[PDB]
Amino acid sequence: GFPTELKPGTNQFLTTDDGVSAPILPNFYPTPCIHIPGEVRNLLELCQVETILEVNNVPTNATSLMERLRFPVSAQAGKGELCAVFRADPGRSGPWQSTLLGQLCGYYTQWSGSLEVTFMFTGSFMATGKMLIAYTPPGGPLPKDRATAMLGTHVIWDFGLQSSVTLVIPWISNTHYRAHARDGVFDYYTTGLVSIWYQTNYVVPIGAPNTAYIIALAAAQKNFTMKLCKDASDILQTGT
Amino acid sequence: ETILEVNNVPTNATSLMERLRFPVSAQAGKGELCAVFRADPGRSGPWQSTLLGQLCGYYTQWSGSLEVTFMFTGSFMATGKMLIAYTPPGGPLPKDRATAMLGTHVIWDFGLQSSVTLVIPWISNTHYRAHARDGVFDYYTTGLV
Amino acid sequence: GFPTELKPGTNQFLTTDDGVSAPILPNFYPTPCIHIPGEVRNLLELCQV
Amino acid sequence: VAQLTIGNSTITTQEAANIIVGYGEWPSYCSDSDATAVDKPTRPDVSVNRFYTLDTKLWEKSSKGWYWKFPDVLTETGVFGQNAQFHYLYRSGFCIHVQCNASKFHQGALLVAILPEYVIGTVAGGTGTEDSHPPYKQTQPGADGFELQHPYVLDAGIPISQLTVCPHQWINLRTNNCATIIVPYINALPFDSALNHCNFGLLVVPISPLDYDQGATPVIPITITLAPMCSEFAGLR
Amino acid sequence: VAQLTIGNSTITTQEAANIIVGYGEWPSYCSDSDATAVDKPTRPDVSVNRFYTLDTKLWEKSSKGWYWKFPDVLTETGVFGQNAQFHYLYRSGFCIHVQCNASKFHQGALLVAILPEYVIGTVAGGTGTEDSHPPYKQTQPGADGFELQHPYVLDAGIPISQLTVCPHQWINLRTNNCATIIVPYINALPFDSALNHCNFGLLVVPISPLDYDQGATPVIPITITLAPMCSEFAGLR
Amino acid sequence: HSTAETTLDSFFSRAGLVGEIDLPLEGTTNPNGYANWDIDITGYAQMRRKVELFTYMRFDAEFTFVACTPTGGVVPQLLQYMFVPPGAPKPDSRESLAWQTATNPSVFVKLSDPPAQVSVPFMSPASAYQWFYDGYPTKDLEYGACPNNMMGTFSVRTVGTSKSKYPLVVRIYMRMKHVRAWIPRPMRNQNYLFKANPNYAGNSIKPTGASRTAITTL
Amino acid sequence: HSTAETTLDSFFSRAGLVGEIDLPLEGTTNPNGYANWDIDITGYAQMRRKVELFTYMRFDAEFTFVACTPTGGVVPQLLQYMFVPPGAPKPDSRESLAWQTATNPSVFVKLSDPPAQVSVPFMSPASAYQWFYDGYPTKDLEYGACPNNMMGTFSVRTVGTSKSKYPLVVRIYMRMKHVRAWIPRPMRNQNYLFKANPNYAGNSIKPTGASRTAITTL
């Protein structure tokens, strides 16, 4: 016999620990795997896919949930009017929960990276006009009016021309720890603020829909991270 | 390219100009079928308005790939998505929008590009036939956009 | 112990499947076969008679 | 304008817009190993490789969306329907092409996508107490498709808000109409049944509701045309 | 989709649309000569170089437009607000990014521009007889901006019909939404006060009035996100 | 920031509790000092939602058996956990010649000894398991149900001819390793109705996530 | 079209059911929880006709034992199948010192465990088995009967001193492998009378195959 002294942790079972143990079926040769199109190797691949951002997450009615996918723009709105507004909070509840990005974050404790919202105008072809999308980094509350909003990073979007514009959120870091009621989860804090404004009124010729909708597509950029796992899932498996 | 009178419904004399274009509007809800026609450059139908069609009439049989283009003329401020879908010979017009998408289709977004083009793979008006007495080589190969 | 995961079909008996199994009589040496005139190797030989 | 002609069919589709190749793979035949090793599977290049144009569906201001199930959709109409019926094993890629004939005075947006193993789930009774697996109408809706009842959850408790995570393509009327998707054979088996198991489903939902100022043809036709890329079958009956 | 991450902030902005670099110059630090020659000004690269996302403003069918004043806007919220308050001299470039979340069923156009030394002028009484220099609310409207009362004359008898002669960018809803502008430090002095003199103003006016067929969220949110490029300060208090 | 915590193996690792057998000395449940547990990786609540992120998966698993008394006490009782390779028949009595058949891997351990652990290889005769099956495996409704996905069956029991002396509770932990996923699909957003299919409440459809007042008010 | 499906091994392969032992708890047949089965490859109906296509054959066999209850149930009962090499004596009691003798290969397996399988080599002391023997092996009629062609004897039984607790049904499957045939002979065309000889109904002789009306009318 070769000399051995046992160290603490002997006979111990750590759910995370991953050493090994014998195969229940030694001589079993698991049918080889063939080639299945589109394998995933790291969830972060997914976090870069654009998914529909339910910015219009207001109608809760059962047969309206489909409206949450898009917000509208129309003749009724006059220049300057604020169209919509949401936060850069891929994690936290809000419009982001609809995106795959969001849903994955929920399975993680903290993260950071650059985001990328896209806006698709689905109105008539004959429709024209300018919308002003503006991002206000953490802190500076939602710009008072359209004017002042423009004095900061913004993009004037013209659907008369390009029917789809993309805005990049510089960086959001959900790492600034916190402790609410008892759910001491690393609260964003870094809630950027995207606001979309009516730069010009909605313009359409006689014969076209005097109201259109805009779909929003978000997704994180290449430089996105996720740290710590958290199996928080309200949708759980139930025995028939 | 010549104007395909897909909206070949109004026959009234002072409306013939409407046959040149079909409409899209607020009244229509998601999923709704907008329009539908066949890939029959020869035979009567919307194709008769095109130069292509009219020439085919001066010929007995033919074959090739086609190319329909769609131009949105709405406002500039107008946005949204239309789903154009082609169903090759056989498979009847898809029941609803969903199932239609499971086959060759193109989601067209006018918010972005104001004009999309769809290619019809191939239509062969060679499958002979003999209707009432006008035994003309009937398409048979009626695709479905 | 070397790591193994079992795939479906484990503990399964397929009448056609033909892997193997040990000899009931290990040391038995089946009397050698001599030469028998006219052996058949494929029924198709017969189908041409 | 430029009409593609592969078969006794001739679709006059756009010259060459943008097509999304599924999972980044062109449907191909097979190396030299399958669910048949002493059974060389005949590869229908004959009439099994032409254009099929399903009965155009009409898009209304209210369509909830539609869906088709492959390979089922065609086992119906077609000589490809002849094969899928008289053969045991099957493997085949695809290529769908959804077109939309509408005017610049209409508006809308369709999300067209391919979802492997698309398992439906009806109401489960009404409120949720009945293990009633959907009818043989929702599992294999022939060549005329079937409508979504709950577009938001794609009829399977999955949010459409995330459907883009599949091979998809948008069809925004003000920007285009035709959309294309090349689907490769996706299965956990080289050769699978072409009559009972539907390798996937093609969905096409109106994300931005169809609309038109009053007076325009209210129904815009969605024409789905598809072509079977690399058909493969084994053992006839 | 691609989210830029420069700081403990992470905005999920478009991949890389078009950004107008102001007066054709990237904001930089300084050669080796200023309003301080035996005073090497510390250059905050720490938390003074992250993303700030101002409280989104709501665009209505009637918004007259808004404006913010730099550097004031941030001397409020932020560690950049910490610097601008505890320091005497200041020099800093910028980079604004205005985003607009709306649907393809809306429409409008916003002119977003940067106007150096943006001096306001109220009504001057009512008709024009009162040398009342605008309130401390119009000269430095914090981080929540301020609305234009006379958009046509930009509140300073200058015609907006010509505002494009400044670093600007359009935001036509049917064509885009996000718009970006990189502002370089523009002043008649190397180092100027960061609390009393506002190097410029950011305007964002609805040139084509917001609109939507009835039933769509009537207010479209305009999210202004900005990043301080090359901050510089001298002597703390 | 190392993107390693976002891999597939780092997402699906960690020993989770998937089974909890119960051998009460006397009562209703498992009145024969033994019970048959079918390997079901959904024994872990939030697991379903997760794996169901993909359409095809492949993996192995390391099962660990933590057994004690209901109180949490350790006792000198010897147990035998047996594995029923999908395809072989399971025990039906406290001495069905099933526990005897060698082709059914058994593993004896006392409660004195630390948890027992073993590795089950990727069973399935397919290239991979598949959470979804859009068809029927060529009266009754056999839809959505995929055959070959059966990982096997663990049969726990107190060694010996007679019943156990103390009440026992065997907890079964399983950590999957070496994972490969394919075809990512939308994330479940409606509560689950049955372990079987993806049916959902056909009226109680709620929005993917919380909602607000107006789209302009944040 | 590959002419491989027409080989000899591809014609004679496939595990066929050749034996079905029966150990009823109580009744008539096999009243001692054991029975002796003589390896007879004609246990499979259509096999006789086939092998009898040739005059001389040589092969090995892989026997498989699928045992359960009459219901088809699995049970914790241990069995012992023993092989009696043609030449050694067979058991006669539930503990004849026969089951004890090593030169009689036994194989214990529980019903829990998957079927038991083993390979019997080409026994015969001749160059090959021979379905026909035109003579007498140098009172009674010993014609046509060929001695050395005996493959052995399987003796099934419930392990243990006492009788089994449940009723049992052991099905015996045998697939022959590595086959060599010789001297092809005409294909049987008259029903079989005895397992012994080739006698046939001496009046009930029917035509090789169906008949028609006239030779001119098809």
mmCIF file of C-alpha atoms in Angstrom, chain E residues 2-191:
data_model
loop_
_atom_site.group_PDB
_atom_site.id
_atom_site.type_symbol
_atom_site.label_atom_id
_atom_site.label_comp_id
_atom_site.label_asym_id
_atom_site.label_seq_id
_atom_site.Cartn_x
_atom_site.Cartn_y
_atom_site.Cartn_z
ATOM 1 C CA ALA E 2 -24.962 45.040 -32.446
ATOM 2 C CA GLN E 3 -24.678 46.667 -28.982
ATOM 3 C CA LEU E 4 -21.806 49.140 -28.433
ATOM 4 C CA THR E 5 -20.309 48.952 -24.887
ATOM 5 C CA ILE E 6 -17.966 51.793 -23.799
ATOM 6 C CA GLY E 7 -18.364 52.014 -20.020
ATOM 7 C CA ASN E 8 -20.592 50.429 -17.363
ATOM 8 C CA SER E 9 -23.257 51.209 -19.963
ATOM 9 C CA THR E 10 -24.516 49.061 -22.831
ATOM 10 C CA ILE E 11 -26.785 50.598 -25.500
ATOM 11 C CA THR E 12 -28.146 48.046 -28.007
ATOM 12 C CA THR E 13 -27.943 50.479 -30.981
ATOM 13 C CA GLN E 14 -27.883 49.563 -34.701
ATOM 14 C CA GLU E 15 -24.690 47.944 -36.086
ATOM 15 C CA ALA E 16 -23.276 51.112 -37.706
ATOM 16 C CA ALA E 17 -25.664 53.401 -39.672
ATOM 17 C CA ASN E 18 -24.544 56.865 -40.838
ATOM 18 C CA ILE E 19 -23.036 59.379 -38.457
ATOM 19 C CA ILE E 20 -22.322 63.016 -39.336
ATOM 20 C CA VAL E 21 -18.988 64.120 -37.914
ATOM 21 C CA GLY E 22 -19.319 67.783 -37.004
ATOM 22 C CA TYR E 23 -17.453 70.370 -39.053
ATOM 23 C CA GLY E 24 -15.322 67.438 -40.161
ATOM 24 C CA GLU E 25 -13.240 67.030 -37.006
ATOM 25 C CA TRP E 26 -12.898 64.312 -34.403
ATOM 26 C CA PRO E 27 -12.870 65.751 -30.905
ATOM 27 C CA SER E 28 -9.297 65.515 -29.581
ATOM 28 C CA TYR E 29 -7.371 66.533 -26.442
ATOM 29 C CA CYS E 30 -4.769 69.261 -27.084
ATOM 30 C CA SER E 31 -1.288 69.837 -28.567
ATOM 31 C CA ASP E 32 0.786 71.480 -25.796
ATOM 32 C CA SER E 33 -0.441 75.096 -25.321
ATOM 33 C CA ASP E 34 -3.567 76.500 -23.626
ATOM 34 C CA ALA E 35 -5.157 78.791 -21.022
ATOM 35 C CA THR E 36 -2.845 76.761 -18.755
ATOM 36 C CA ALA E 37 0.912 76.415 -19.587
ATOM 37 C CA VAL E 38 2.317 75.368 -16.156
ATOM 38 C CA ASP E 39 -0.932 73.526 -15.349
ATOM 39 C CA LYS E 40 -1.113 70.047 -17.006
ATOM 40 C CA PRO E 41 -4.932 69.466 -17.249
ATOM 41 C CA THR E 42 -5.989 65.964 -16.120
ATOM 42 C CA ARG E 43 -7.981 64.165 -18.860
ATOM 43 C CA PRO E 44 -10.886 62.130 -17.321
ATOM 44 C CA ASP E 45 -10.801 58.767 -19.095
ATOM 45 C CA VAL E 46 -12.335 57.079 -16.021
ATOM 46 C CA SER E 47 -16.151 57.269 -15.575
ATOM 47 C CA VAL E 48 -16.268 60.510 -17.595
ATOM 48 C CA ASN E 49 -16.103 58.314 -20.733
ATOM 49 C CA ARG E 50 -19.287 56.167 -20.671
ATOM 50 C CA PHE E 51 -22.800 56.280 -22.111
ATOM 51 C CA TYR E 52 -25.402 58.679 -20.766
ATOM 52 C CA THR E 53 -29.030 58.128 -21.726
ATOM 53 C CA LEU E 54 -31.228 61.200 -21.121
ATOM 54 C CA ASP E 55 -34.852 60.769 -20.079
ATOM 55 C CA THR E 56 -36.625 59.947 -23.323
ATOM 56 C CA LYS E 57 -38.877 62.759 -24.610
ATOM 57 C CA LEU E 58 -42.297 61.907 -26.033
ATOM 58 C CA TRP E 59 -43.084 63.055 -29.563
ATOM 59 C CA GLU E 60 -46.732 64.023 -30.119
ATOM 60 C CA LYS E 61 -48.706 65.056 -33.180
ATOM 61 C CA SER E 62 -48.060 68.489 -31.727
ATOM 62 C CA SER E 63 -44.508 68.672 -30.306
ATOM 63 C CA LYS E 64 -42.905 71.962 -31.349
ATOM 64 C CA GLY E 65 -39.428 70.505 -30.913
ATOM 65 C CA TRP E 66 -36.837 70.453 -28.139
ATOM 66 C CA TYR E 67 -33.301 71.577 -27.370
ATOM 67 C CA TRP E 68 -30.533 70.957 -24.890
ATOM 68 C CA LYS E 69 -27.503 73.010 -24.016
ATOM 69 C CA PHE E 70 -24.020 71.569 -23.751
ATOM 70 C CA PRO E 71 -22.095 71.174 -21.571
ATOM 71 C CA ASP E 72 -24.872 72.071 -19.150
ATOM 72 C CA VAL E 73 -27.186 69.131 -19.977
ATOM 73 C CA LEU E 74 -24.828 66.740 -18.187
ATOM 74 C CA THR E 75 -23.238 68.901 -15.469
ATOM 75 C CA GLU E 76 -26.402 67.674 -13.782
ATOM 76 C CA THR E 77 -26.572 63.879 -13.755
ATOM 77 C CA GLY E 78 -23.308 61.986 -13.953
ATOM 78 C CA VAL E 79 -19.730 61.796 -12.740
ATOM 79 C CA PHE E 80 -19.150 64.110 -15.698
ATOM 80 C CA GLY E 81 -21.510 66.280 -13.662
ATOM 81 C CA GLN E 82 -19.100 65.794 -10.788
ATOM 82 C CA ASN E 83 -16.202 67.107 -12.883
ATOM 83 C CA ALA E 84 -17.985 70.055 -14.513
ATOM 84 C CA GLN E 85 -18.948 71.193 -11.007
ATOM 85 C CA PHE E 86 -15.711 70.765 -9.056
ATOM 86 C CA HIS E 87 -13.473 72.122 -11.871
ATOM 87 C CA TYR E 88 -12.680 75.633 -13.099
ATOM 88 C CA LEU E 89 -11.630 75.299 -16.758
ATOM 89 C CA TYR E 90 -13.095 72.802 -19.254
ATOM 90 C CA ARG E 91 -12.693 71.513 -22.822
ATOM 91 C CA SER E 92 -14.517 68.489 -24.212
ATOM 92 C CA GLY E 93 -15.762 67.092 -27.489
ATOM 93 C CA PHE E 94 -18.893 64.943 -27.806
ATOM 94 C CA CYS E 95 -21.007 62.490 -29.669
ATOM 95 C CA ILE E 96 -24.745 62.589 -29.557
ATOM 96 C CA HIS E 97 -26.950 59.740 -30.730
ATOM 97 C CA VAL E 98 -30.717 60.327 -31.106
ATOM 98 C CA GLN E 99 -32.884 57.162 -31.521
ATOM 99 C CA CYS E 100 -36.533 56.819 -32.376
ATOM 100 C CA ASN E 101 -38.673 53.789 -31.545
ATOM 101 C CA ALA E 102 -41.697 53.763 -33.824
ATOM 102 C CA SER E 103 -43.536 51.369 -36.148
ATOM 103 C CA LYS E 104 -43.809 51.176 -39.915
ATOM 104 C CA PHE E 105 -47.384 52.447 -39.400
ATOM 105 C CA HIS E 106 -46.266 55.850 -38.142
ATOM 106 C CA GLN E 107 -44.606 58.663 -40.052
ATOM 107 C CA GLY E 108 -42.596 61.799 -39.554
ATOM 108 C CA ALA E 109 -39.265 63.509 -39.926
ATOM 109 C CA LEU E 110 -36.986 65.073 -37.348
ATOM 110 C CA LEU E 111 -34.182 67.463 -38.156
ATOM 111 C CA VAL E 112 -31.454 66.945 -35.563
ATOM 112 C CA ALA E 113 -28.715 69.547 -35.387
ATOM 113 C CA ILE E 114 -25.895 71.119 -33.427
ATOM 114 C CA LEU E 115 -25.795 74.922 -33.217
ATOM 115 C CA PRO E 116 -22.752 76.541 -31.535
ATOM 116 C CA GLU E 117 -23.481 79.375 -29.114
ATOM 117 C CA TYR E 118 -27.249 78.878 -29.219
ATOM 118 C CA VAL E 119 -28.550 82.137 -27.728
ATOM 119 C CA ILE E 120 -32.248 82.112 -26.951
ATOM 120 C CA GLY E 121 -34.618 85.038 -27.037
ATOM 121 C CA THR E 122 -38.072 84.813 -25.479
ATOM 122 C CA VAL E 123 -41.100 86.839 -26.660
ATOM 123 C CA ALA E 124 -39.372 89.999 -25.348
ATOM 124 C CA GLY E 125 -42.513 90.690 -23.306
ATOM 125 C CA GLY E 126 -45.401 89.738 -25.578
ATOM 126 C CA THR E 127 -45.398 91.943 -28.694
ATOM 127 C CA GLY E 128 -41.802 93.209 -28.459
ATOM 128 C CA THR E 129 -41.169 95.842 -25.765
ATOM 129 C CA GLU E 130 -39.160 94.342 -22.854
ATOM 130 C CA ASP E 131 -35.352 93.665 -22.796
ATOM 131 C CA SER E 132 -36.092 90.532 -20.729
ATOM 132 C CA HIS E 133 -33.167 88.182 -21.366
ATOM 133 C CA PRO E 134 -34.654 84.618 -21.248
ATOM 134 C CA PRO E 135 -34.976 82.822 -17.814
ATOM 135 C CA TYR E 136 -32.306 80.580 -16.272
ATOM 136 C CA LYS E 137 -34.600 77.851 -17.575
ATOM 137 C CA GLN E 138 -33.990 78.584 -21.260
ATOM 138 C CA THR E 139 -30.255 79.322 -20.925
ATOM 139 C CA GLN E 140 -29.461 76.032 -19.149
ATOM 140 C CA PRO E 141 -32.449 73.555 -19.379
ATOM 141 C CA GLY E 142 -30.720 70.796 -17.433
ATOM 142 C CA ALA E 143 -30.838 67.216 -18.671
ATOM 143 C CA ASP E 144 -34.515 67.326 -19.565
ATOM 144 C CA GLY E 145 -34.225 69.904 -22.302
ATOM 145 C CA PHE E 146 -36.691 72.601 -23.174
ATOM 146 C CA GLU E 147 -39.368 73.124 -25.826
ATOM 147 C CA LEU E 148 -39.262 75.613 -28.675
ATOM 148 C CA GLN E 149 -42.028 78.205 -28.539
ATOM 149 C CA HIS E 150 -41.471 79.470 -32.027
ATOM 150 C CA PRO E 151 -39.947 76.564 -33.942
ATOM 151 C CA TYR E 152 -39.967 78.545 -37.180
ATOM 152 C CA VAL E 153 -37.479 81.120 -35.849
ATOM 153 C CA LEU E 154 -35.687 78.679 -33.521
ATOM 154 C CA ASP E 155 -36.458 81.049 -30.661
ATOM 155 C CA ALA E 156 -33.804 83.443 -31.949
ATOM 156 C CA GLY E 157 -35.150 85.105 -35.051
ATOM 157 C CA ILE E 158 -33.145 82.771 -37.238
ATOM 158 C CA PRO E 159 -35.135 80.675 -39.791
ATOM 159 C CA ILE E 160 -35.110 76.956 -39.238
ATOM 160 C CA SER E 161 -35.498 76.768 -43.016
ATOM 161 C CA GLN E 162 -31.698 77.112 -42.967
ATOM 162 C CA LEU E 163 -30.671 75.146 -39.843
ATOM 163 C CA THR E 164 -29.128 72.441 -42.042
ATOM 164 C CA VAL E 165 -26.150 74.770 -42.447
ATOM 165 C CA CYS E 166 -25.038 73.279 -39.131
ATOM 166 C CA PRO E 167 -23.892 69.770 -38.339
ATOM 167 C CA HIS E 168 -27.187 68.011 -38.808
ATOM 168 C CA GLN E 169 -28.790 64.701 -39.606
ATOM 169 C CA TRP E 170 -32.343 63.819 -40.626
ATOM 170 C CA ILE E 171 -34.571 61.220 -39.024
ATOM 171 C CA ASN E 172 -37.347 60.340 -41.431
ATOM 172 C CA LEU E 173 -39.388 57.579 -39.846
ATOM 173 C CA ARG E 174 -40.125 55.731 -43.070
ATOM 174 C CA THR E 175 -36.373 55.519 -43.710
ATOM 175 C CA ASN E 176 -34.571 55.324 -40.350
ATOM 176 C CA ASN E 177 -34.631 56.518 -36.744
ATOM 177 C CA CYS E 178 -31.224 56.600 -35.136
ATOM 178 C CA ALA E 179 -29.063 59.524 -36.219
ATOM 179 C CA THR E 180 -25.610 60.415 -34.929
ATOM 180 C CA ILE E 181 -23.460 63.533 -34.691
ATOM 181 C CA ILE E 182 -19.916 63.815 -33.393
ATOM 182 C CA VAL E 183 -19.331 67.307 -32.084
ATOM 183 C CA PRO E 184 -15.820 68.694 -31.708
ATOM 184 C CA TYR E 185 -15.020 71.364 -29.111
ATOM 185 C CA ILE E 186 -15.996 74.666 -30.740
ATOM 186 C CA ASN E 187 -14.982 77.811 -28.861
ATOM 187 C CA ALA E 188 -12.945 81.012 -29.206
ATOM 188 C CA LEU E 189 -10.917 79.866 -26.216
ATOM 189 C CA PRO E 190 -8.897 76.694 -25.580
ATOM 190 C CA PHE E 191 -10.301 76.191 -22.071
#
